[PDB]
Structures are given as C-alpha cells and as structure tokens.
From a paper:
Legionella pneumophila is an opportunistic pathogen that causes the potentially fatal pneumonia known as Legionnaires’ disease. The pathology associated with infection depends on bacterial delivery of effector proteins into the host via the membrane spanning Dot/Icm type IV secretion system (T4SS). The Dot/Icm complex of L. pneumophila is one of the largest known T4SSs.
Models of DotC, DotD1, DotD2, DotH, and DotK were built within the map of the OMC that was reconstructed with C13 symmetry imposed. The asymmetric unit of the OMC is comprised of one copy of DotC (brown), DotF1 (purple), DotK (cyan), DotH (orange), Dis1 (Lpg0657, blue), Dis2 (Lpg0823, green), Dis3 (Lpg2847, tan), and two copies of DotD (red and pink). A DALI search of Dis2 returned no significant structural similarity among PDB entries, making its function difficult to infer. Dis2 is positioned near the outer membrane and consists of two lobes, similar in both sequence and structure, that are pinned together with a total of five disulfide bonds, all of which show strong density within the map. Dis3, predominantly a β-helical protein, is the major contributor to the ‘arms’ that extend outward radially from the disk of the OMC. Finally, we identified ‘chain 3’ as DotF (DotF1, residues 208–266).
Author numbering:
A (entry chain Fd): 25 to 55
B (entry chain FD): 24 to 162
C (entry chain Ed): 56 to 160
D (entry chain ED): 110 to 162
E (entry chain FK), F (entry chain EK): 40 to 188
G (entry chain GH), H (entry chain FH): 271 to 361
I (entry chain FC): 28 to 35, 60 to 161, 173 to 268
J (entry chain EC): 153 to 161, 173 to 228
Write the structure that this text describes.
Amino acid sequence: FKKPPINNPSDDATIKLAEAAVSVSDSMLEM
Amino acid sequence: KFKKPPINNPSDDATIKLAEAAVSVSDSMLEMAKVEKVITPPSKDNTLTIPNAYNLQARASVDWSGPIEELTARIAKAAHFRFRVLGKSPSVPVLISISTKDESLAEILRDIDYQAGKKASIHVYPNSQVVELRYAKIY
Amino acid sequence: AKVEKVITPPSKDNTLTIPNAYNLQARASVDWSGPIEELTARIAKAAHFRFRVLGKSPSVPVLISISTKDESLAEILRDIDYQAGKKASIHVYPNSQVVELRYAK
Amino acid sequence: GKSPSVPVLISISTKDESLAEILRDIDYQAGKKASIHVYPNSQVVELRYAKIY
Amino acid sequence: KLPCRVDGACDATIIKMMTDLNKKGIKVASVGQNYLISIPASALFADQSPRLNWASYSLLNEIAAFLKQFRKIAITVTSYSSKYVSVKRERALTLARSRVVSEYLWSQGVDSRIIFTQGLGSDKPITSYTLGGDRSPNARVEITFRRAV
Amino acid sequence: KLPCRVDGACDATIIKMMTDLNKKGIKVASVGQNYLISIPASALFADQSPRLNWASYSLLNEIAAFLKQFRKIAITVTSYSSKYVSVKRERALTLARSRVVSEYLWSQGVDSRIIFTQGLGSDKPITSYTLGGDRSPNARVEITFRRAV
Amino acid sequence: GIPPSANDLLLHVLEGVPPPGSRRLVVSGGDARAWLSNEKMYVRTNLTILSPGWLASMTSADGTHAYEMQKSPVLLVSWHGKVMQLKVEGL
Amino acid sequence: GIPPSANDLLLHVLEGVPPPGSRRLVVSGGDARAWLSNEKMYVRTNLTILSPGWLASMTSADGTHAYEMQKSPVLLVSWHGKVMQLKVEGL
Amino acid sequence: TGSLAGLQKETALSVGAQAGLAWRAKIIDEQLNKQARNLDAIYDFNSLVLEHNILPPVLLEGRNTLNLADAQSIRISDRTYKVAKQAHFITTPPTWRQYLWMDYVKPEAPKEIWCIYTERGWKNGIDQANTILEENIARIKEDFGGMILYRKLLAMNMVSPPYVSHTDLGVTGDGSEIHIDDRVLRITALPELNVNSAEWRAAVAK
Amino acid sequence: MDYVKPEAPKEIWCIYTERGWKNGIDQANTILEENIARIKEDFGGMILYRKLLAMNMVSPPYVSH
Amino acid sequence: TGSLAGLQKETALSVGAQAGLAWRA
Amino acid sequence: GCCSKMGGINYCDSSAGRLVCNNGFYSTCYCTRHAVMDLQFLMGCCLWHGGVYPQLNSSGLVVCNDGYVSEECSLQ
Amino acid sequence: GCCSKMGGINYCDSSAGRLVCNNGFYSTCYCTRHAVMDLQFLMGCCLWHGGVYPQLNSSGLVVCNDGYVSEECSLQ
Amino acid sequence: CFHPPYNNFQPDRRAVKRVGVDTGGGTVGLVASIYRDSKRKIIRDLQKQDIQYVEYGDTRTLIIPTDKYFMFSSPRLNEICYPGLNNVIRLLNFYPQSTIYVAGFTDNVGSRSHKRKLSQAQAETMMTFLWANGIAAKRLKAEGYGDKNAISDNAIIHGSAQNRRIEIQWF
C-alpha cells in the first residue's frame, strides 16, 4: 500500500512557507 | 451537517509568523527581479557553453549544500566524462546550494554554472568528453 | 459646504484627455519618485513614440511620484500632467507619433 | 494626485439614498481637499487630491 | 549525553532484513563496503509497461526501511530489460521504470544526497538463457551504493 | 476583564438557526467566507405588489436575529421577479421590494456599515421552468454578505 | 600602512603541534582539534566551517585547514554536502 | 531656523525593530505594537488614529503606519469606517 | 461598593514563568529544526554577496513623512532613504541560526489556589517566548529587506558601488621567511547615496 | 467622566449614608454641567470666528511654503 | 521541570585517573 | 464551550486572532489579545490625558501628566 | 548489545570512530567522540555568541561575550 | 473485487458482491444495495471526505481541495485519495446529458504566470481524469483562474487555505 511523504506539507502554514520558498528560489534563479 | 472542504492538521504560530515574513520577502524579491530584468535585458544563454549529448540524459535528484568541485566531479563521474580544473582555487570557498528533483545532468550543470556567477564557470566538450571547471581571474 | 465649495465646468477643465492611440493601452507597473523628464522619456520609449522638450529646466526640478501596479500608459501620462501643475504640460500627437513636454515661461 | 500625510476624514450617515447623491454629499464634505468626477461614457469614478502642500 | 549510535539503526535489524529479503527473492549482496540490491522486474511492474502494481508498494516500503539503516552519499538505480521491438523503446521503458522507482524512493525518507537514474535497455545481460520476457532473469532493476564510514 | 468572544453570538445558535431556516424553506448557503440567504417572494409579499404581509415580519425578525450573529461591513440585497406587463414595471417593482426589505432590516439592529439595494427585474433566472407567477422559484430576494475576520 | 601577512602559529597548527602556553579544548561530533592561547581559538580540521566566521586561514598540501578565529562553543560545518554542528567544551 | 526633518527611529519602528533602551507596552483590543523610550510612545499599526494626536508620522510601502506621540493609556482608532478604542498598559 | 442597598500566589506566578518559557523555547527550536532547508532557501544570504566577498549595505526607506516640530511650522517630505549599515569584507556568509535560534537551558531548580496562579505564570511565559521570537523575526527581516533594497537602488542608479584597489607584490621577505605571491586588497570608496537627480534612471515594466 | 470602582469600605447610620449618597450625585451633576459649558464655549468661539470672517472684522492666517 | 502536570564521588574521580594513566602508559 | 455543536476546537489562528473549529467554520471566540474587539467602555482615571502622574501625595488629590486635576479620583 | 546477531565486538577502529564486529561488518555504534554525528540540537545559552561571560552578577541577568544580553537565561 | 488504482477504468460491480456475500438474505442485500446506490448516500460519503456539494436552482457545483487531492505544487493526482474521485465519478454518472465546466483556483503567493499555469495544469488534469472514465470530450471544458475571484481573505492563514480549489459545475 502506498504511503504519503514523511516531510509533506500537511499544514496550511507549512504549505504557504514552502511555496514562498519555491518562489524565492525561482526569483533568485531569474536574477 | 455543514462543513467546508480544507481541514488540515493543526498549525503552529511560529510557522504562521515565518510564513507571514516569507510572503513579503517573496514579493519584495519579485519586485526587485522585475526591476532588474527591465533595466538590464540579457542577450546570451549558456546552452552554447554547455551543450548536451548522449549519456548526459541520465537523471539525478540532488540535495547538496557544500563546495562546487566535489559535486561537479560526482556529476562528471556519473556522466562518464573526464574532469578538468583550471585556475587557482580561492581561499574563501565558492559555496553552492542545490535542491532539485528528477532533472537532467546538463540542466543540473547549467544551474550550477548560473549559481556560481562571477567566481567560476563550467564548460562541456562532448567530442573529447570533458567537463571543465575554471576559476575567475580575480585576487 | 454648498456655499463654500467652488467647482470648475467640465468644458474648460485644463486636464489632458485620453489620446486613444492604440500603442498607449499597454498596461504597466511604475514605481518612481523623482524628475518628470526621465520618466516621461521612458514612457515614450515603452509606447514607441518620440519625445521632445520645449522650454528650459529650472534650478529646482519638477518632482513627481507615480506608484502603480497595473495602469495604462495614457492614464500614467494624465496623472503626470495633473501632478506637474502649472509648471509643465504634456502634449500627445498621434499622427506623427510624438510627445512634447512644454515648460511654463 | 498624491494622498496627504494628514488623512482626509469624512462622516456620512444617510438612509435610502441614491449613489449620485451620496457621491455629491461626499464631494461637498471633502470640499477643498479632494474632488469627485464621474464619466459615464467611460464608466469611471475619479477622485483627485488638491494641489496643496 | 552524546549519542551512542546512529539513530534508527541496528545490526540485528540489518541482518534480519537481509535474511528476509534473501528468502523473499530480492538479491542483497555486499562486497567490501559496496552494497547491491537486485530486483526482478516482474515483482514490480506489469508486462513491459512502466506502471507499478498496487501490491509492490509493500516491497518498496521494505526496501526503503532497509535503506534507512545506512549512511550514504550517492545511490545509483539502473534498469535492464529484454528485446521486444527496438532499442529506443527498451531504453525509454528502462528510463521510465528507473524514474518511477527512484521517485518513490526519494518520496520516502532515505537520507542520501544524490540519486542517479539510468536505463541501459538490453545491453548488459547476466544470463545467456534469453527465452522469457519480463520473466527472464536478465530483466531487472539494480540499486547500488557504498556505505560511508 | 477583556471580552472572550463577540457579544450576543454563539456558534451553536448559528448552527441552530441555519438548520431551522433550511427546514423552514429559506435557503442559507456558505462558500468560503461568503454567505447567501435566498427567500421566495411569495413568503414575503402579495401577488406582484410591493406590500408586505403582516405575518412576514416574524420571518424578517428571524432573518435579522440570524444577521446579528456575524461581523460585517456591507450587505447586498437584490430582487428578482417574473414577466408580467413590461420591463419598466417589473424593475420598479423589484426596486420597491428591495427598498422595503432593506428599510425593515436597517430599522432592526444589524451592525453593518453599508447596505446596497438593487432590483434586476427578470434578467437572471435560476430555473428554466417559468410557468408560475410569484409562485415560480425564480421570483426571489437575495441577501449576500462576507463575514469579516 | 601595510596589513600584517598572517599569524605564524598556524604552521604549527597545520603540523598538529599546539601553540606554547595554550590549553586544550574538547571537541565532540566530528574530527577536529581546538586550542585556546590568547583568548583566541585555533581549529585544525579538514571540514568546511560555515557560520561563525574566522580571522585567518591556511591550508596544507594534503587538504588540512587551519583557522584562527574568536572563541565560540558551537561550530557549523559541512561534511560531504550535509550541514551539521560540532560542540566545543572547556572554554 | 529650519525645522528638523523627522525622527529616523521611525524607520526601525516601520520595520518592526524596537528602539534600543526602550521597554515594551501591552496593547489590547486591536493589532498594534507600542514601545516607550524617552517618555514618548512609538506605535506600529495599520489602523487610523483619530483622537489623541501624534507628533511625527511615516508610512511604509504596504500601508503600515508609524507614529511618534506622547504617552496615553487609550487610543481612538478607525477600523473599517467604525470607531473603536485600544487600551495601552505598562505605562 | 455598588448600590446604596449594597452599602447597607506570587511565588507560583514566579515559578510558572520559567518553566513555560523553557518549554516554549524548546518547542520553537524543534519547529525551527523541522524547516531547516526552507529557511535556507528563503534567507539565502550567500547569493547577495558582491564580487570581492563584500556584504552589501543595509538601506532603509520611508514614505509620506510629516513632522510637527512646534506650533506655526511643519516639515514634510515625500520619500527618505537612509544607510543603516555599511559594507565590509567578510569571510563567511550569515545564516538564519544567528537570528532565529532561541536559547534553551533545562531548569531543574524548583494547594487550594496554587494551580490557577501556576497556570497563569505558564501562559505568561509562553507569551514572553512568542514576543521574543517575533522580535527575532523582525530583526532578520530588516537586514534582508535592506540588502534587497540596495540592489534595487543600484539598478535604478541611486547608490554608488564600492571600489576595490589591489596591490600585487612579488616574492617578499628576508632569508628567514619568504612569501611567494603577496596581494593586498583594500576598498577605497564606500557605497553612498547620490544627490544628483538628473543622473537617475527610471524603469517601466511592460 | 472618570470611573474607578471603589472597593475600600445602625440607628442613625442609614439616613446620613443616604444624605452622602445624594451629595455625591449632586457633585457629579455639577462636574458634568461644567464640562458641557466648557465644550459649548469652545464650539461657539469657533463659530464666531467664521461669522466675523464673513462680516470682515478678522484677518485670515497667512501661510508661506 | 518539564510539563505543567510535572510541576503540579569526587575522590573516586580523583583516584581512578592516575591508575588509568599509569596503566595506559 | 467555544465550538459547540461542531467537531470541537482545531487550532488558534493568530493571524486573525480567532479559533478555528474542526469544521471549516471560524469560531466566535478570541484566542489572542490582538483581535478586533469593539471596545467602547474603558476604566481608570486621568483618561484622555497623559495618565496618572505617579507621585505619592500627602493629600488625596490625583494629578494627571498634563497638569490637570481629576476630581473623580480625588478624595474629599 | 552493539554487535548483536553477529560474532561480537572485535575492536574499536579509532581512524573511523566505529566498532568492528567479529565478521567483516562495521558496527553502528560509536567508540570515540571524534565520530561523525548528525548533531542538530545543542543545549546551553549565549549560543551563536562568544558564550556566557563568567562574571558573577548581583542581578539575574546573563551577558554574553559579545555584549549581548540573553533574555531566556535571565531571571525575571 | 476492486482494484485500488481506478479499477482499470472499468465500471465497478459493487452490488453483486454484497448480495452474494449476504446469503450465508437476498431481500436484505437488495435493501442494502438500493440504500447504498442512492444519490443521498453518495452525497453523505462525499461529505465524509472533504468535498463540498452545492445545489441552487438547476446548477450543481462540487468543490475539491487541491491541498488534499493533488501532490504539492504539481499537476500530479494524489492516488491515496481514490475513493473521493470514484465517488465524484459515481455522482456524475447520474446526469448523462449535462455539460461539465472545471475551473482551478490558487492563492496569492507566487507570480501571476506561475499561478495561471498551475491552475491551468490542474484543470487539464482533472478534465482528463473526467474524460477517461467515459464522459465524452465535447461535454467538457477546463479553465484555470489565478487569484482573480477568491471566496475568502488571502491575508489570513485559514482563508488563504480555503482559496486553493477545483470547482466542477454542471447544469
């Protein structure tokens, strides 16, 4: 049976923090 | 019964405050990147310096937070290419931080070359099968 | 308030209208606080017009402040002309595609 | 125009009034600090600040 | 106050997992400090398609639980298949199989820095008996690493 | 010494009145933070006239008592009717109905800053079955708002 | 004026001989040695020091690093692409 | 005599860093922070202050206000067109 | 006290706060350790460092400024820019652990109305730890925002870049000690704001 | 007006307690009357300036920028 | 010490060291 | 009981200063002090002045920080 | 039991900081303090400063070697 | 039986297993089948998972959260939450003549093009999963909006969490 990732953003603040980190990394790559 | 769909795990106020800081950091970076891109339009891409070939299309998932030379040597060894170093290594080390998932070795090398910036450069010669890392003529 | 308030008729309102030239409806995001000349030149370059100045610059330059996220170039030019006041004016000619910054004598 | 550092405050307390009359009362109470214009052919409500300070 | 061992690991658990995997049929080999896990393709995938069965996730969880017992830097996943139509379809199939296996392994919590994936098609066979399809012993996926310190 | 909640409000009371209104026939809907109350015109007004019945003030009191439980800035009241004679008469009828309903709601003690009133006539139906008069389901009054914080 | 070149104690730190008059410090969590001589901390290791910042540095032929830095009870290091911490006692 | 331009400490108040040497105040009833440094209150909020009167003011890019004023145990604010009060403790 | 007819502990508060502060600090440190890679992705100080390993300066911005100095006279301004910190040579980039990590030491140094005051002190200690963490977050946000603002004003040509002079000595020293390739690097011009507004460059984003 | 709750406390006690109860209410009414007179004086003085400015007996303030 | 519910020799160390030092030497 | 006739309290959202219940509905209870409270009645004297000036007095007079004398807190 | 289900402990290899079992397998146990441990949580205060400055104080304040004051180890 | 990965895109024979196991009653099994095959039982099951159903007039809407029915920041479909998707297919089987609109919505974090592309990719993935179960391609249309018309407040954590969704409307 399939399992979820253990370091998964299952919290509504962790989701926002992780997508903010993704956008920051994308902006740094563009710069 | 009355319910609304997103019901997740309970949150922590420390993570709430960190997210509130990070959103404003992110859109400040968005404004700065837009201003810099508008002021200075780039004209060249590193596809000419780093081209692709066969057996550079094997894939990798990498999470590395150290110096550039060991990671570049591991990528070259997995890509079955010789590794060459040009120039003197600086006394202050060139640090990179890569955290990706399932992309090609040429794309990984291009991201490492972009993050190195003005300190180091990556070149690929597929005829001789050579990956070359060169340091900048600084200090 | 009815007694004290004074108005102007819309026939003699000294404000630049929308020139409705097709190159001036492109949206833009502008953050600027400084002289009028440099911003007006960049607005003309983004609208692919020419830019010319008639008059002379004073000792103290004319300072404007435009901070918008999504606004048309004609509306930006109208806000610039309103903020300039009696010291400068902006004219738009679309037949020969040019903008003119005219100083007050 | 530029918004002033001291804010322009209004106090409105009406009941069952049209939007044009509400905008006219807001424009009268604002007075010399701000003005309200309505362009119906372009469907634009415009608020302009005074050329002061 | 200092830790006495690497956390979540035990030598008895390592020996038990090695014995259970060898009795199940997954080949676990260790020479020096190098470790190899060899898996038949029929226990993971369907008939020559890059789609995992729903029951192979328990085996993948067992392999991930074995892989969490060591400290390592780089893992290599290499796929091999048999002759079906042409070399391009075999190479693409093996690359897709290695991609899916390494994606689930990276989704689970292995503490590695780099995972490399490659699929070599049908270039390196280990057995001259090539009559089967995916039931042939030379259609497999291999997970190789080196124990660090 | 500080207050522990918003005064005169309880979530159990909110759920109770939503359940009672939904069993009575007044539609209460909530998506995200937006709230909608839909009332048929036959339960409030007479046959195509802007005159309230005397017994509908109890229903209006229940709607006001439900509306006092939330904190809000703006309320929108919109009226819809069916085709009777022309478009002018039905737009004037819907505007008058919205004016009367909003006047009684503002007379009662709802703590809102702005209440907007409009009547759209018969431009936006919700049901293709248009055989009834005021008994049709697409002759209605709608009260929409957003819960603030 | 010309700034000074380096500190010559780092050659002995590279060779592994402690400076004279110094005392030993206990380092746990990794392969590193530390000494304290004149309210300054001398670290001999082959890891990469990331966070606390150092004042002077030398490198040997085989890849060993010698650092001169301020005293600190924690060091942040990079081992093989993984970031970890070393604990310094005896300060 | 040219009057002074502003107080440059309101930039740190805008960023949210407390002034050095100050002590914190407790603010109840709304989203605001306050500090007391030299018998003057420094208030960071995004509301509108109506009654007590302030001495200096700055505004950030996202709409956050910073005020310099005298000490008072009550503030009158406008939230969304509605007037309420904030209570300040620790004075 | 009321109507005319109406007319006719501290040690528990002290001991709860230390335990609440230590417990909340430990939980905050655990939550910080759960998100180590995301914080490194967000507060990436390493890619903002200039060419000669120089940390960029910190700049502060204010808009719509008013001062009532005294009665009959006021002073107003549209925007103001200030240099808070100055550029300098670095050997290592900063990290988020020097800003956000809270300090934890286990306190092992210890009934009708005891429990309510103990739990009141517990809530007070939790609130104190939350306030400390909020101040730390603001302190790191100020420096990162100033470093971004320096690059944006450098793009719009309002600050000057630092200037580096290098002196290349040869084989120096006496017969007891030699150095092969001496290089002395010194920065001569610090970054500064310019006041010539005619040289500024505007940016219009399509 | 200022409110602080006082929590710091029989043959002829009740009548004199009632007399003091009346006296405190009278004092509070006097204080409120004085406050009303003060705010009325300030507002009427501000209206009188506008009336005399319309009647041209006062000068307006002059601002230099 | 811990939770809210939780709220509600040298001479041997001296003498071992010389013997261990001499034996290891 | 805050989240009554629901699934109970999920967590305190400090961005809005409100409790979130086990359904998707916001609760009416507060859980931080920096929540929007409609405060209209405040206690204490020398209000709308600088506050109570902290000197200790031989008499019962109470003086504010702006020189005003509070007759309500003053002892007769 | 470190080398459990094996032949038992052979010796401590101090060049790697690990025990060797009686087979050729390295053990998971450490035997020196200079072994690679993944330490992420460290105790003590005035961390990321010079450490605790060793003066004895009349008050409960704790000062670090860089002039910083640690509020967490400070007594209220 | 039932295959957990989508039952090989086959119509599930759900009633015959229950009426075959409830014999060692046939009438009791038929009563259980006609209860559990009803529309209201499907609506209550979708209430047990985190999917909202709104009916108003003759327009019906399903609200599905991407945070639990998608992988993180990707257009991949989360395969652990397959009973909810099977219940969506079972509910949509009752209306064989209506047209289907699917729309994707995200929160305010990120760039505008990134938000539009992520919403469009999630909408295409959901429309493809609807198409592969038997629904014809001429009855489907997908659209991805950004943070254009939200239903909650994006300045708060729970309100921003409520805005990331997939909306399915039919007549």
